[PDB]
Every structure is written in C-alpha cells, then in structure tokens.
Amino acid sequence: PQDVVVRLPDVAVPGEAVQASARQAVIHLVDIAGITSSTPADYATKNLYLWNNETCDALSAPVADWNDVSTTPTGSDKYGPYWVIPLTKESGCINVIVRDGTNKLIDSDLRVSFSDFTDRTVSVIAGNSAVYDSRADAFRAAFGVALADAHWVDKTTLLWPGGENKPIVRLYYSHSSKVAADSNGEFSDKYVKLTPTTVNQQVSMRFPHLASYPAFKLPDDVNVDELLQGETVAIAAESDGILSSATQVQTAGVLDDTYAAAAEALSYGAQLTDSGVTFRVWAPTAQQVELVIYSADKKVIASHPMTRDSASGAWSWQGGSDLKGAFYRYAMTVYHPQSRKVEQYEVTDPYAHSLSTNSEYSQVVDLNDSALKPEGWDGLTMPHAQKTKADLAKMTIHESHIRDLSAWDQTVPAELRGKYLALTAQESNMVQHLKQLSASGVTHIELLPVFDLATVNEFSDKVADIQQPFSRLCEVNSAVKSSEFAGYCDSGSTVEEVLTQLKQNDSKDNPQVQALNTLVAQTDSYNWGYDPFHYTVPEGSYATDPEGTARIKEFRTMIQAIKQDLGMNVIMDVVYNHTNAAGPTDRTSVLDKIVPWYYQRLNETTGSVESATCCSDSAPEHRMFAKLIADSLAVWTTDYKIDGFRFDLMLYHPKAQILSAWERIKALNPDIYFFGEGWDSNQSDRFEIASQINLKGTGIGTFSDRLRDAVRGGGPFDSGDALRQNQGVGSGAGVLPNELTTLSDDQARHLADLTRLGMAGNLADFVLIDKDGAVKRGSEIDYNGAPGGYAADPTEVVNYVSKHDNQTLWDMISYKAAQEADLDTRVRMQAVSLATVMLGQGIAFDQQGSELLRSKSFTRDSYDSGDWFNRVDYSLQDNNYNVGMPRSSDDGSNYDIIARVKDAVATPGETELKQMTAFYQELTALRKSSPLFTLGDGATVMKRVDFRNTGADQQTGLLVMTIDDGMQAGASLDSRVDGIVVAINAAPESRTLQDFAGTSLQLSAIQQAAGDRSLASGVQVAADGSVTLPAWSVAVLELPQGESQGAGLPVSSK
C-alpha cells in the first residue's frame, strides 16, 4: 500500500572492464559499496599482494614484500578498479590477496586457476572469497538470491542474520517461478512483512543452534499453506528500498509447527483396510500429488489426483481391494529449493513395504497375508529371553552378512548362495557350523543391512560375480576391456580363477589382485549395504526373485530358520542416520523428492545437505522423520519378528528420539533391545545426542570402544608402523614386545585397567585399583581423554574385539605379534583376546568368523571389497589370510608394514581353524555356564565383581577377576558355586596365583572336559590351593558350594 518498493540498485548490470591478453590475467574488484554511487570513489590505496609458491607459480614479477603497496589498479570505471597482471604462462594459477593499503579486503588467500577461468579475467568482491568469471556474476551475487540462511522455524518466527538492523525485512513468495527482480529491476512478487522480535523460549529449545539468530515476526494472520507451496525468499533492503541481501528459506521448523501434530495422527503408505486400499503420503509443500497405478509389466493403468488434508499436509486416496499387489508411484508436482524449480517426477513410497526389481516401483502389500508367511510363522517364538537385565546380559552376538555366510559354501545349493534362504540349507557346512556355535552359546545373529539397500543392482543381467566366467564380467563392466586384464575376456576361466592366478606374483609393488577386484566391485553382488533406498522393505538381491512380494516370504523363512532351526535371536542393523542420496534428480533420492529439505539435515547457512555420516545426513530431530523411523521399526518388530535393533551412527540421533522410538516399540514387544554406536557426531549444539555418555541409565546399549582398543592395540585410525607398534593386551603389550614398539610398562598396565573395567561392564562407578595402585572409579580411568567407564548397567555396554568395520582381530594380531610368536601362539592370542569379551559382564559381540581366525588380507574397510576379501571358508581350509594386498585406495599407506609382517608364520589351515573353533565354543559355553557371568545389573556387579593382581607391581598381562556368590554379596545366584575366578594369562610366562591358597578352588568342569584342547590345558591346582597358569591361557575356576551359601569371594571396600 504505502510500502516502499524493494529494488536492485538503479545501475546496469556491469560488463567487463578489460579482457586479459596473452601472458596476462585480469582481476576486477567490483565496488559494491561505491556502486551505490554518491562520491566518485578513489581506488589509489587499493592494491594486490602477489606471490609465487609451489601450488601457483604463474606470476611474472611478484613482489614478496608485504609492506609494498605499489601494485595499484591498472584502471577503473564506475564499477571498481582492475589489475592487469603479467604472467609467465597461461596455465596453472596465481596467488593474490586483495588489499586496501596493508589491510585485506578479502581475508583469504585467493587462488585464481586458469583451468577454471579460461579467459583469466575474474572478479571478486570485498568480504567474499569466491572468484567469479565475470563482473556480472559477482554483481548478481551481491544483489541477488544467494545461500539459504533464513530459517522459518514456526508460524510467526523467521530467524535470519541478513535482516538484523535493516529498514525493510520481508518474506517474499512466488507460487510458480523463482523470485527475481522484474524488468523494472523491482521485486514485485507478493510478500509478508517482518518486524524485529525476540526469539521465544520454545523456539530456542527446539533449535538451540539458531537461538543467536536475529529474530523476526510474521503477522498472526499469514496463510502459511499458501507460502509453503512455492519458493519463499527472505529479502532485506535499505531505507530507499535498495536490496541489501536475499536468501532462500529453510522451512522444516514451520512445517512441523504447522502440520506435525495432525500428520502424526495418520498412517502412511498403501494400506489394506476393510473397504479396500487407502494410500497416504506426507507432502505438505506439494502443489499436486497424483497416485499412478501400474500393471505388472509397468503400464500406467490408472492415475488418481489425491486428496489434500489441510490440517496435516498429507495426501490420501481410496480405491478397491483389487489394488493389492499393484505397483504404484506418487507423481509429484513440488518446488525443490535446491533446484528452485517446481519439479515433476514420480517417486516410490517412503512407506513402501514391497518393491519391484531394483526398487523402481512400490507395490501394494498386506504383510499379514498367510501367503507371505512360512508355515507356523504366527507362532514363532524367541529362543532366548530378553526380559530381565540378566536375560539381556547373556546376549552373545554373531555379526553376519548374507553373502559372507554362503557365497563360498559349495554345500549350499548354488541357487541359495548369497541368499536369505541359504540359512534353510540344513546340511550345509555353514548352517551346521552355525548350529554348533548356537549349541555352545552363541545366542544372537546380527544381520548387516537386509533392508532395501541402493548399491547392488538387483537386475541379475547387470551383475557379474567372481564365480561366473570372466567373459560375463567383461560383458557387464565396460571398464574391464580397457584395463590391463582385458586379455582375460577370452580366457574361458572364471573371475575367481583369475584372481587366484593373480595371487602368485602379487606384492606391494605389483598389487594386481586388488587391481582386478576394484573393477569386480563395481558390478558384483557385494556390499555391506549401509546405503538406504527404502527403510521398510527387505533387500531384493538376497531374494531368489526380486520382482514383487517374493522377498517377503523368503526373508521370513530365513528369520524362522534362524530362530527355530538354529536356536538364535535376530538383530537387524538399521541405518536411519542418512539416506543414500538427496536432491531432485538422483535415482535413490526418495524422501527429499517428496518433502524437499525436510528429511535431510542441512547446513544452517548454505542449506546444503550435510555429509558427516558419509552420505546424505538425515534429520531424526524432525517430527515426521521420527515418526517414519518409529513406524518402520514397528513393521520389522511386528511383521518380521526382529528381536532387536543396532542403530548405525546412533550418535547422529537425538537421545529423546531414540528413547521415544524405544517406548513406541516396547508397547509392541516389551523385550525388544536397542543399541548402537554412540560416538561424537558433532551434533550436540542442535540437540542432546544419543551418545555413550548421555545414554547412561536409559537401558539403550552402546558399543564400547574401551576394552576393544585395549585388547586389540592402538585405534582404528592407526596407519603404517603404528599398526605394529601399538600392541594390545591380546597381542602381548609390555610382555612380548615386537621389534618396533615403545610401549612402556605403565602404558601396558593402563590397557589392563581398560580391559578389567570392560570385563566388569565398563560402569562409570565400578571401583578398581589402577595401574599405579590408586583407587579409581570407572569414569576416572582415562580413555583418550574421555571418562573410560560410562554406563550404569553392563547391559548398556557391548564389548567386542572384532566387527565388520576396521581390521579383523586376526589381521591385528598379525600386524602386532612379535616375530617369535609362532602360529599356535597367535591362535591362543586370538582366543585370549576373545576371552576378555566372552567372560566379561558386558553384552558380548563378535564378528562372524572370529572362531575361524577370519582374515581380510589386511583390508581395513571391506564394505565394497567383494567376495574375495570378505570370504569365510566353512570348509575350514584357510582363514582367507594372504590372498593379495588389500585395496590401495584405503590401505596403500600400509603396504610397507604389511609386506614386513605378512609372512612371519604359516597361514592357518584346517588344524588351526578347528582348534580356534573349539577354543571359541569353550569360551561361549563358559559364559552361559553360570548366572555369575551375566549379572545384568550395575549395582549387582559392583557388589560381586573384583580383581586380583592389580597395582604398580602386578604381573603384566595377567587378568584375574573374581565374582562373589557368597553371603556378603547377597543371595546365592548360583547353586553350585560360592564364587568364580577368571584368569586370563596374556603372557609368555607361566604364572602362579597365591590369592586363593587354602580355599578348595577347582577348575571348571567344561575346561577339564576339553582336556588337551582346553584354553586351560596344563593348568595346575595344587593341594594348598595355589594355581599355576600356562602361558597364553584362560582358566575359569570355582569354589564348590556346600550345604549353604558360603563366604565365597567378598569384594573389598576400597
């Protein structure tokens, strides 16, 4: 009405002042402030500081004297000065700092690369590190839309820095095109006016990382629905109406404030009801949603405009029951801020529960149909209780992958290899071995991603695996024909045969096994699968038939076989912390095509999707993604009967969201167990992260890296010689040093503190004697600066010495073992390492194949290293060690230490594999042989668990843990013993325990039964009660119980 028009400056868009000639570059400085003319500006003090280094050396006559300010403009016009800079060449780059006198106008060393700017004529603006190809580009950067640092966070609140102390602050909006200056240089699109305000108490709680932003108020009567359906741009301008800045707007907060309450009350996806099928998708900013129905062979057979619910922003449509089994997509008409286009594209359902091949179409499914269930499904029971804390503590996890299990097993029928259904091949080597492990006390199979991953092509015609002819690899992988292995295209042999042949002359100098495998990896069936395409459909490539609903019944047939034939519970790895892709174009961008910029976490200034997870970071702090996560877990829980969930990068989730999700799932099944990897995501400024520290008391488990690093040695980022120098307790730190290490006795005793603390459940308040003889709480033992112990209960701690990521335990032992440790001794180092986990109070977790000395040929990160490096040989011929140098892209800087250590001893064969398996099953049998091993409750651990051989004069490497079942502990939780002693002698010397002299201690019956094959072979208990431990041994001893609960092994009050 009376409002002043916002406009561009009343000056033209500038052309170039000069263009560089030969052996010249030209830099324009675009004088934004003086473009708002007034005074004819003076550029005499403007100058360039120019110098040559090794990166950029194309300057003819640089002057290194920083106090020389004589490189003043060559000329100037109304848009600013410019510099003609002589060069020695027209390739490369030059270094420049843009100054007024000795003050930098741009606080950033500038690179001007002649490759990026071919005409070598660039423009820059004060207070801006960007180099522009032209003055027009730079001009439109200053007077044009840029970045996205405005945040519309609820109905009436915009947070934006660009607005602070400006006469005009307005929220412009255009339904159908990009807000831009019109032909009169004016911004004539509709706008809402914003007045300064103060951030409110609940916005600052919601977005703490934004609470220091200049706040602004919208009229209470603004119709948010209309603004949110197109582009919105926050604009600020001076008194005269000249644009000061303009930026795109992030709207996830106001979307939640507007719609989330209503939208959370609805159910989503294609849902079978009484009357028929209800489709519902959440798309609060979409202009149109059309439900497209497809025939089996993917012809459109109907297209239905959906009904928008204005309270929720959800779109719904109702049709007949005959739509069960039909394929469908949502045809979206929606503005995407990244492209600033009203996009039109068909997207699969984020609540899809069935998919076509390679996830191209979603499919209507009723998971309850008996046709999709194996016989007996509805009565499938959990073979291991998870109700009490003592129940949870018994959990003993075997972390497995669908291809790692069966890809190599000739006794698995060929068509089931690398498939869910391989777990049904009851006579196979793999299933029999798993059945043996279960009988001995492995309780849980944990499955690497078996939700719908993106990074395997489910069209089998497009895939070549190493068991197929090399000619098939050349057919599907067009890079092989121009590679140095092209000659094998005609060879008539398989890829597996070629890789084997390449072993012979493979070395750090000729890494040819790895070279061929990198090409194999692009088109094979192999990936860990941490690449979410759809969260609540099984992966299709693990199915015999990926087209439609078949995968659902095969997945359940697998789940049933694991629980019912193998006797184990099932944990799923889940990856809700990121999506595989974002933006409006990428094939696997689903969530971000339907509600752009809502499901991804964005940079607060640029609005780019963050990638701290690896990929496209998600936003579980946002309410409708929290609901998606929880609804997703409900399907896996109820419809697939999953006993627990391991959250990948759980630290990227809010603690409140994880706990919310968990309460939601416990209402379905109270015994469901949640845990994850809870490091530091660097998100604590946005919310309270779900980290090891913050989850104390909550009952949410976390992987503990404390005992892990103490027993393995070093840490996951070690490289080069450090891989060998950093020995662990399991590999003889301080007692059997290798030729490189400098580990001191103090350092070795510190690792033993971390190990003891972990064997008592890594509790914050457990009290032990440390390396110096000092009394310490678990939280007082240092771990790389953090409090070491952090939990309230041992069930909150998952101990392990090996996992899918980072090197296998055997490869660590190979890096670190002294040259004098022979093969048999390294096998005992492996079992000694695993004993710290298996006999500890924390939940026990292990990588598939540790019982077979599993190797990945030193591969640190094998996620895409194929069948070759991830092989597990259930025919027990070898442990996959020394099968070629690992991938150079990630382990090249370790080739030197690998070649130095690799051949110290023979590669394990069947004799060593069987011995390790017996050791492993001995350990797992011991773990479940008494309730004392798995007390579950932190206060109960504190009252019953203690250690001998502590303090500054301990025998290094001897771990002696006592577990009290005598009167002062309380109740006798174990009818056969008054106490247990665990002795792990990780040392080359035989040792004698006198702590139990005169006490009637005796060796556990399990170990006596193993005899010569026991980890305790040769242990001697003398008449006086002194115990002699062999080198590299594990012994479990017990005080036999009498007619009543005895004195046992009382914990000392320290």
Ligand SMILES: OC[C@H]1O[C@@H]2O[C@H]3[C@H](O)[C@@H](O)[C@@H](O[C@H]4[C@H](O)[C@@H](O)[C@@H](O[C@H]5[C@H](O)[C@@H](O)[C@@H](O[C@H]6[C@H](O)[C@@H](O)[C@@H](O[C@H]7[C@H](O)[C@@H](O)[C@@H](O[C@H]1[C@H](O)[C@H]2O)O[C@@H]7CO)O[C@@H]6CO)O[C@@H]5CO)O[C@@H]4CO)O[C@@H]3CO
């Ligand atoms: O070999 C010298 C140097 O070469 C390269 O530096 C570039 C640099 O990247 C450009 O930015 C520019 O440097 C300018 C600065 O931009 C400008 O601000 C000013 O620097 C002042 C500093 O702000 C101020 O701290 C102080 O510098 C000290 C400094 O604190 C000391 O630590 C010491 O610096 C040494 C560096 O630590 C060392 O790495 C190396 O520097 C390299 C650099 O690696 C490379 O990127 O050597 C220096 C010592 O020679 O000494 C100085 C003592 O003054 O004071 C200066 C103002 O005097 O000025 C510099 C240029 O003089 O250009 C340089 C290339 O010249």
Ligand SMILES: OC[C@H]1O[C@@H]2O[C@H]3[C@H](O)[C@@H](O)[C@@H](O[C@H]4[C@H](O)[C@@H](O)[C@@H](O[C@H]5[C@H](O)[C@@H](O)[C@@H](O[C@H]6[C@H](O)[C@@H](O)[C@@H](O[C@H]7[C@H](O)[C@@H](O)[C@@H](O[C@H]1[C@H](O)[C@H]2O)O[C@@H]7CO)O[C@@H]6CO)O[C@@H]5CO)O[C@@H]4CO)O[C@@H]3CO
């Ligand atoms: O985060 C980027 C990272 O991505 C991948 O790493 C994985 C890794 O495979 C997993 O083990 C896990 O890492 C966890 C650890 O399990 C956990 O212990 C903790 O790590 C701490 C270390 O124990 C401790 O030594 C220290 O690490 C330092 C380290 O000495 C530095 O070198 C530096 O690390 C950098 C790496 O060198 C670099 O390769 C990359 O890491 C990638 C990695 O390549 C990939 O496989 O970037 C990091 C930058 O941080 O700094 C760190 C810390 O400053 O401290 C750490 C941190 O507490 O936590 C980590 C995860 O944070 O998960 C990661 C991520 O998926």
Ligand SMILES: [Ca+2]
């Ligand atoms: Ca140019």
Ligand SMILES: [Ca+2]
């Ligand atoms: Ca898939």
Ligand SMILES: [Ca+2]
């Ligand atoms: Ca692959």
Ligand SMILES: [Ca+2]
């Ligand atoms: Ca951040």
Ligand SMILES: [Ca+2]
């Ligand atoms: Ca007892």
